[PDB]
Protein backbone atom coordinates (compact mmCIF):
# COMPACT_ATOMS: atom_id res chain seq x y z
CA UNK A 1 0.00 0.00 0.00
CA UNK A 2 1.18 3.53 -0.87
CA UNK A 3 2.99 5.08 2.12
CA UNK A 4 3.20 8.89 1.79
CA UNK A 5 5.93 8.92 4.47
CA UNK A 6 8.31 6.43 2.79
CA UNK A 7 11.58 8.15 1.86
CA UNK A 8 13.53 7.46 -1.31
CA UNK A 9 17.27 6.74 -0.94
CA UNK A 10 20.01 9.25 -1.65
CA UNK A 11 22.78 6.73 -2.39
CA UNK A 12 24.89 7.96 -5.32
CA UNK A 13 24.37 5.85 -8.48
CA UNK A 14 28.14 5.14 -8.62
CA UNK A 15 28.04 3.62 -5.12
CA UNK A 16 24.96 1.57 -6.03
CA UNK A 17 26.74 0.29 -9.14
CA UNK A 18 29.59 -0.89 -6.88
CA UNK A 19 26.97 -2.80 -4.86
CA UNK A 20 25.57 -4.42 -8.03
CA UNK A 21 29.10 -5.38 -9.11
CA UNK A 22 29.77 -6.97 -5.74
CA UNK A 23 26.55 -8.97 -6.01
CA UNK A 24 27.59 -10.40 -9.39
CA UNK A 25 31.29 -10.94 -8.60
CA UNK A 26 30.46 -12.69 -5.31
CA UNK A 27 27.81 -14.84 -6.98
CA UNK A 28 24.97 -13.55 -4.80
CA UNK A 29 21.30 -12.79 -5.49
CA UNK A 30 20.12 -14.27 -8.81
CA UNK A 31 23.43 -16.10 -9.19
CA UNK A 32 23.16 -17.86 -5.82
CA UNK A 33 21.46 -21.24 -5.69
CA UNK A 34 21.29 -23.54 -2.70
CA UNK A 35 22.50 -27.13 -2.36
CA UNK A 36 20.16 -29.37 -4.35
CA UNK A 37 19.61 -26.78 -7.08
CA UNK A 38 21.25 -26.49 -10.49
CA UNK A 39 21.50 -23.46 -12.76
CA UNK A 40 21.04 -24.21 -16.44
CA UNK A 41 20.20 -22.67 -19.80
CA UNK A 42 17.96 -23.84 -22.62
CA UNK A 43 17.24 -22.50 -26.10
CA UNK A 44 13.59 -22.11 -27.09
CA UNK A 45 12.48 -20.40 -30.32
CA UNK A 46 15.88 -18.71 -30.60
CA UNK A 47 15.72 -17.25 -27.07
CA UNK A 48 18.18 -18.58 -24.48
CA UNK A 49 16.32 -19.17 -21.21
CA UNK A 50 17.98 -19.43 -17.81
CA UNK A 51 16.39 -21.74 -15.27
CA UNK A 52 17.10 -23.35 -11.94
CA UNK A 53 15.86 -26.81 -10.97
CA UNK A 54 15.96 -29.32 -8.15
CA UNK A 55 14.46 -32.65 -7.23
CA UNK A 56 13.68 -35.55 -9.53
CA UNK A 57 10.63 -37.62 -8.66
CA UNK A 58 7.06 -36.40 -8.12
CA UNK A 59 4.77 -34.13 -10.12
CA UNK A 60 6.90 -31.30 -11.48
CA UNK A 61 6.16 -27.73 -10.41
CA UNK A 62 7.08 -24.86 -12.73
CA UNK A 63 7.49 -21.40 -11.13
CA UNK A 64 7.33 -18.20 -13.19
CA UNK A 65 8.43 -14.94 -11.53
CA UNK A 66 7.45 -11.39 -12.46
CA UNK A 67 8.61 -7.78 -12.43
CA UNK A 68 11.27 -6.86 -9.87
CA UNK A 69 12.01 -10.56 -9.47
CA UNK A 70 13.84 -13.45 -11.13
CA UNK A 71 13.71 -17.23 -10.58
CA UNK A 72 15.30 -16.42 -7.20
CA UNK A 73 11.98 -15.29 -5.70
CA UNK A 74 10.98 -18.97 -5.63
CA UNK A 75 14.09 -20.42 -3.93
CA UNK A 76 12.55 -21.01 -0.46
CA UNK A 77 9.51 -22.81 -1.92
CA UNK A 78 11.69 -24.84 -4.30
CA UNK A 79 13.84 -26.05 -1.40
CA UNK A 80 10.72 -26.90 0.58
CA UNK A 81 9.26 -28.99 -2.25
CA UNK A 82 12.29 -30.57 -3.92
CA UNK A 83 12.26 -33.69 -1.72
CA UNK A 84 8.86 -34.71 -3.14
CA UNK A 85 8.81 -32.75 -6.38
CA UNK A 86 10.78 -31.84 -9.43
CA UNK A 87 10.91 -28.03 -9.07
CA UNK A 88 11.67 -25.67 -11.96
CA UNK A 89 11.89 -21.87 -11.91
CA UNK A 90 12.53 -20.15 -15.22
CA UNK A 91 13.69 -16.57 -15.85
CA UNK A 92 11.14 -14.77 -18.06
CA UNK A 93 12.39 -14.01 -21.59
CA UNK A 94 14.67 -10.97 -21.45
CA UNK A 95 14.77 -10.91 -17.63
CA UNK A 96 17.13 -12.42 -15.05
CA UNK A 97 19.73 -14.37 -17.04
CA UNK A 98 17.40 -15.14 -19.97
CA UNK A 99 18.08 -13.43 -23.30
CA UNK A 100 15.70 -10.90 -24.89
CA UNK A 101 12.94 -11.29 -27.46
CA UNK A 102 14.61 -9.33 -30.22
CA UNK A 103 11.49 -8.34 -32.21
CA UNK A 104 10.06 -6.89 -28.99
CA UNK A 105 6.98 -9.15 -29.04
CA UNK A 106 6.48 -9.65 -25.31
CA UNK A 107 2.79 -10.48 -25.70
CA UNK A 108 1.21 -13.35 -23.73
CA UNK A 109 1.01 -15.63 -26.80
CA UNK A 110 4.64 -15.17 -27.80
CA UNK A 111 6.10 -15.61 -24.29
CA UNK A 112 3.78 -18.60 -23.76
CA UNK A 113 5.09 -20.18 -26.97
CA UNK A 114 8.66 -19.70 -25.80
CA UNK A 115 8.03 -20.99 -22.28
CA UNK A 116 6.02 -24.12 -23.16
CA UNK A 117 8.67 -25.47 -25.53
CA UNK A 118 11.26 -25.19 -22.78
CA UNK A 119 8.95 -26.57 -20.09
CA UNK A 120 8.13 -29.65 -22.17
CA UNK A 121 11.87 -30.40 -22.45
CA UNK A 122 12.81 -29.66 -18.82
CA UNK A 123 9.71 -30.95 -17.01
CA UNK A 124 8.98 -33.83 -19.36
CA UNK A 125 5.70 -35.31 -20.55
CA UNK A 126 3.76 -34.24 -17.48
CA UNK A 127 1.39 -33.52 -16.03
CA UNK A 128 2.79 -30.60 -14.05
CA UNK A 129 1.62 -27.87 -11.70
CA UNK A 130 2.14 -24.25 -12.77
CA UNK A 131 2.70 -21.33 -10.39
CA UNK A 132 2.96 -17.75 -11.59
CA UNK A 133 3.53 -14.29 -10.05
CA UNK A 134 3.32 -10.66 -11.27
CA UNK A 135 4.41 -10.43 -14.94
CA UNK A 136 4.39 -14.22 -14.98
CA UNK A 137 0.60 -13.77 -15.04
CA UNK A 138 1.04 -11.67 -18.19
CA UNK A 139 3.39 -14.16 -19.85
CA UNK A 140 1.42 -17.31 -19.09
CA UNK A 141 -2.34 -17.33 -19.64
CA UNK A 142 -2.28 -18.69 -23.23
CA UNK A 143 0.26 -21.31 -22.09
CA UNK A 144 -2.04 -22.48 -19.28
CA UNK A 145 -5.32 -22.19 -21.20
CA UNK A 146 -3.98 -24.02 -24.27
CA UNK A 147 -2.31 -26.78 -22.27
CA UNK A 148 -4.93 -27.90 -19.74
CA UNK A 149 -4.21 -31.54 -19.01
CA UNK A 150 -0.46 -31.15 -19.35
CA UNK A 151 -1.07 -28.42 -16.77
CA UNK A 152 -3.01 -30.26 -14.07
CA UNK A 153 -3.46 -27.24 -11.79
CA UNK A 154 -2.45 -23.58 -12.01
CA UNK A 155 -1.86 -20.73 -9.56
CA UNK A 156 -1.67 -17.02 -10.38
CA UNK A 157 -0.23 -14.73 -7.72
CA UNK A 158 -1.21 -11.17 -6.75
CA UNK A 159 -1.11 -9.35 -10.10
CA UNK A 160 -4.03 -9.29 -12.54
CA UNK A 161 -3.96 -11.43 -15.67
CA UNK A 162 -4.18 -9.08 -18.68
CA UNK A 163 -7.81 -8.49 -19.65
CA UNK A 164 -10.14 -5.61 -20.57
CA UNK A 165 -9.93 -4.23 -17.02
CA UNK A 166 -6.27 -3.38 -17.65
CA UNK A 167 -7.70 -0.61 -19.84
CA UNK A 168 -9.57 0.58 -16.71
CA UNK A 169 -7.21 0.48 -13.68
CA UNK A 170 -6.93 4.10 -12.45
CA UNK A 171 -3.68 6.03 -12.46
CA UNK A 172 -4.67 7.81 -9.25
CA UNK A 173 -6.77 7.05 -6.17
CA UNK A 174 -7.81 8.51 -2.82
CA UNK A 175 -4.85 6.55 -1.43
CA UNK A 176 -2.41 8.07 -3.98
CA UNK A 177 -0.89 6.39 -7.09
CA UNK A 178 -3.15 3.61 -8.33
CA UNK A 179 -2.72 0.16 -9.85
CA UNK A 180 -3.00 1.68 -13.31
CA UNK A 181 -0.15 4.18 -13.24
CA UNK A 182 2.79 1.85 -13.82
CA UNK A 183 1.09 0.22 -16.85
CA UNK A 184 1.23 3.68 -18.42
CA UNK A 185 4.67 4.82 -17.25
CA UNK A 186 6.28 1.51 -18.26
CA UNK A 187 4.83 1.71 -21.81
CA UNK A 188 5.53 5.44 -22.35
CA UNK A 189 8.20 5.28 -25.05
CA UNK A 190 11.65 4.40 -23.68
CA UNK A 191 11.36 6.97 -20.88
CA UNK A 192 11.12 4.50 -17.96
CA UNK A 193 14.04 2.53 -19.37
CA UNK A 194 16.25 5.61 -19.69
CA UNK A 195 15.21 7.22 -16.40
CA UNK A 196 15.48 4.08 -14.27
CA UNK A 197 18.78 2.97 -15.86
CA UNK A 198 20.24 6.24 -14.60
CA UNK A 199 19.58 5.15 -11.00
CA UNK A 200 17.99 1.68 -10.69
CA UNK A 201 18.55 1.55 -6.93
CA UNK A 202 16.60 4.79 -6.38
CA UNK A 203 13.55 3.70 -8.36
CA UNK A 204 13.41 0.06 -7.29
CA UNK A 205 14.14 0.63 -3.58
CA UNK A 206 11.17 2.97 -3.46
CA UNK A 207 9.05 0.79 -5.78
CA UNK A 208 9.80 -2.49 -3.93
CA UNK A 209 9.28 -1.02 -0.44
CA UNK A 210 6.03 0.65 -1.60
CA UNK A 211 4.36 -2.61 -2.51
CA UNK A 212 5.78 -4.49 0.48
CA UNK A 213 3.67 -5.05 3.57
CA UNK A 214 6.73 -5.94 5.65
CA UNK A 215 9.17 -3.21 4.59
CA UNK A 216 11.79 -4.03 7.24
CA UNK A 217 12.75 -7.21 5.35
CA UNK A 218 14.21 -5.09 2.55
CA UNK A 219 17.69 -4.19 3.78
CA UNK A 220 20.04 -2.32 1.42
CA UNK A 221 21.95 -5.57 0.70
CA UNK A 222 18.79 -7.52 -0.11
CA UNK A 223 17.64 -4.61 -2.24
CA UNK A 224 20.97 -4.63 -4.13
CA UNK A 225 20.53 -8.36 -4.82
CA UNK A 226 16.99 -7.72 -6.09
CA UNK A 227 17.87 -4.70 -8.21
CA UNK A 228 21.15 -5.86 -9.79
CA UNK A 229 19.20 -8.03 -12.32
CA UNK A 230 17.34 -4.88 -13.40
CA UNK A 231 20.32 -2.53 -13.44
CA UNK A 232 21.02 -2.17 -17.17
CA UNK A 233 19.14 -0.67 -20.14
CA UNK A 234 18.90 -4.06 -21.86
CA UNK A 235 17.15 -5.66 -18.87
CA UNK A 236 14.86 -2.66 -18.36
CA UNK A 237 14.02 -2.58 -22.06
CA UNK A 238 12.98 -6.25 -21.85
CA UNK A 239 10.94 -5.71 -18.66
CA UNK A 240 9.06 -2.77 -20.16
CA UNK A 241 8.43 -4.72 -23.36
CA UNK A 242 5.88 -6.73 -21.35
CA UNK A 243 4.10 -3.45 -20.64
CA UNK A 244 4.29 -2.20 -24.23
CA UNK A 245 2.81 -5.53 -25.27
CA UNK A 246 -0.10 -5.47 -22.81
CA UNK A 247 -2.72 -4.23 -25.30
CA UNK A 248 -1.73 -7.20 -27.46
CA UNK A 249 -1.84 -9.60 -24.49
CA UNK A 250 -5.28 -8.28 -23.58
CA UNK A 251 -6.69 -8.88 -27.06
CA UNK A 252 -5.15 -12.36 -26.99
CA UNK A 253 -6.54 -13.30 -23.58
CA UNK A 254 -9.96 -11.85 -24.38
CA UNK A 255 -10.05 -14.05 -27.47
CA UNK A 256 -9.20 -17.14 -25.42
CA UNK A 257 -11.93 -16.30 -22.88
CA UNK A 258 -14.53 -15.79 -25.61
CA UNK A 259 -13.45 -18.79 -27.69
CA UNK A 260 -13.97 -21.53 -25.10
CA UNK A 261 -10.54 -21.35 -23.45
CA UNK A 262 -11.54 -20.49 -19.89
CA UNK A 263 -9.95 -22.63 -17.17
CA UNK A 264 -11.50 -26.08 -16.64
CA UNK A 265 -8.65 -27.29 -14.44
CA UNK A 266 -8.51 -26.37 -10.75
CA UNK A 267 -7.06 -22.89 -10.38
CA UNK A 268 -6.10 -20.54 -7.56
CA UNK A 269 -5.82 -16.79 -7.13
CA UNK A 270 -3.31 -16.30 -4.32
CA UNK A 271 -2.71 -12.68 -3.30
CA UNK A 272 -1.40 -10.33 -0.63
CA UNK A 273 -3.84 -8.17 1.34
CA UNK A 274 -1.26 -5.36 1.26
CA UNK A 275 -0.29 -6.01 -2.36
CA UNK A 276 -2.71 -6.00 -5.30
CA UNK A 277 -5.22 -7.57 -2.86
CA UNK A 278 -8.61 -8.55 -4.30
CA UNK A 279 -8.26 -7.58 -7.98
CA UNK A 280 -7.00 -10.95 -9.26
CA UNK A 281 -9.39 -12.79 -6.92
CA UNK A 282 -12.46 -11.02 -8.37
CA UNK A 283 -11.07 -11.18 -11.90
CA UNK A 284 -10.53 -14.94 -12.08
CA UNK A 285 -13.84 -15.73 -10.40
CA UNK A 286 -15.83 -13.48 -12.72
CA UNK A 287 -14.12 -14.18 -16.03
CA UNK A 288 -11.52 -16.96 -16.05
CA UNK A 289 -13.07 -20.02 -14.43
CA UNK A 290 -15.55 -22.35 -16.13
CA UNK A 291 -16.67 -23.89 -12.85
CA UNK A 292 -16.23 -22.00 -9.53
CA UNK A 293 -16.20 -25.36 -7.77
CA UNK A 294 -12.64 -25.77 -9.07
CA UNK A 295 -11.53 -22.26 -8.09
CA UNK A 296 -9.71 -21.32 -4.86
CA UNK A 297 -9.13 -17.73 -3.75
CA UNK A 298 -6.75 -16.87 -0.90
CA UNK A 299 -5.70 -13.40 0.25
CA UNK A 300 -2.79 -13.50 2.70
CA UNK A 301 -3.27 -11.02 5.56
CA UNK A 302 -0.49 -8.50 6.32
CA UNK A 303 1.35 -9.57 3.18
CA UNK A 304 2.38 -7.27 0.35
CA UNK A 305 3.20 -7.99 -3.32
CA UNK A 306 6.52 -9.78 -2.69
CA UNK A 307 4.68 -12.75 -1.29
CA UNK A 308 7.48 -15.30 -0.80
CA UNK A 309 9.89 -12.73 0.70
CA UNK A 310 7.21 -11.52 3.13
CA UNK A 311 5.26 -14.67 3.87
CA UNK A 312 6.90 -17.85 2.58
CA UNK A 313 4.96 -19.86 5.18
CA UNK A 314 1.61 -18.53 3.94
CA UNK A 315 2.55 -19.08 0.30
CA UNK A 316 3.78 -22.62 0.98
CA UNK A 317 0.71 -23.55 3.04
CA UNK A 318 -1.61 -22.18 0.34
CA UNK A 319 0.20 -23.94 -2.50
CA UNK A 320 0.45 -27.23 -0.58
CA UNK A 321 -3.24 -27.28 0.36
CA UNK A 322 -4.28 -26.43 -3.19
CA UNK A 323 -1.74 -28.45 -5.19
CA UNK A 324 -1.32 -31.52 -3.01
Q: How far apart are the first and last CA of the chain?
A: 32
Closest CA to 109 of 144, 150, 142, 66: 142
The stretch among 4-12, 48-56, 115-123, 211-219 that binds a second copy (CB under 8 A) is: 4-12
Q: How far is the CB of 195 from a second copy (least distance, A)?
A: 4
Nearer to a second copy (CB atom), residue 6 or residue 34: 6
Task: Please say which residue, 134 or 147, places its beta carbon nearer to a second copy.
Answer: 134
Residues 164-203 that bind a second copy (CB under 8 A): 166-185, 187-191, 194-196, 198-199, 202-203
CA angle 58, 143, 247 (to 5 degrees): 150
Best CA proximity match to 223, nearest among 16, 2, 49, 15: 16
SS3 1: coil
Residue 138 CB, shortest distance to a second copy, in Å, is: 12
Side-chain-facing half-sphere of 221: CA atoms under 13 Å: 3
| Residue of the chain from 206, 217, 264, 279 that contacts a second copy (CB under 8 A) | 206
Q: How many residues bind a second copy (CB under 8 A)?
A: 44
In angstroms, the Cα distances linking 322 to 160, 250, 270, 290, 294 are 20, 27, 10, 18, 10
Beta carbon nearer to a second copy, 13 or 58: 13
| Cα gap 200→17, rounded to integer Å | 9
Q: How far is the CB of 223 from a second copy (least distance, A)?
A: 15
Q: Which residue, 26, 81, 90, 95, is CA-closest to 52?
A: 90
Q: Hey, CA dihedral for 17, 19, 21, 24, is it positive or negative?
A: negative
* Nearest distance, CB of residue 70 and a second copy, angstroms: 23
CA dihedral 18, 20, 26, 32 (to 10 degrees): 170
Min separation Cβ 163 and a second copy, Å: 12
**Residue among 206 and 295 whose Cβ is closer to a second copy:** 206
Closest distance of CB 181 from a second copy, Å:
2
φ, ψ dihedrals at 37, nearest 5°:
-105, 150
CA trace torsion 257, 261, 267, 273 (10° rounding): -20
CB of 324 vs a second copy, minimal distance in Å: 37
| Of 36 and 170, CB closest to a second copy | 170
Give 99 or 200: the residue with its C-beta nearer to a second copy: 200
By CB under 8 A, is residue 255 in contact with a second copy? Answer: no
Site string for a second copy, 8-47 (x = CB under 8 A): x---------------------------------------
- Which residues, numbered 110-169, are part of the site for a second copy (CB under 8 A)? 166-169
Which residue, 13 or 117, has its beta carbon nearer to a second copy?
Answer: 13
131: β partners: 63, 155
CB of 31 to a second copy, least distance (A): 28
Binding site for a second copy (CB under 8 A): 2, 4, 6-8, 166-185, 187-191, 194-196, 198-199, 202-203, 206, 210, 244, 246-247, 250-251
Amino acid sequence: EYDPNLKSIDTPPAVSQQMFNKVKSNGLGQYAYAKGLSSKFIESEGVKLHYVEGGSKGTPIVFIHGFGSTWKMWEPVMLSYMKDHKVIAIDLPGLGQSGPILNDDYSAENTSKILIGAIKKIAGKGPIYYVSHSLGNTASYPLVANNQGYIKKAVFMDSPIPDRAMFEYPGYTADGPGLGWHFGYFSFGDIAEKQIANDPNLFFSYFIKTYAGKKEIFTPELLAELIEPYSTRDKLKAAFGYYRSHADSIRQNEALLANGKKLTIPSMALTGQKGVNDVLVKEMRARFVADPAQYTAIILPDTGHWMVEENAEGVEKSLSNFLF
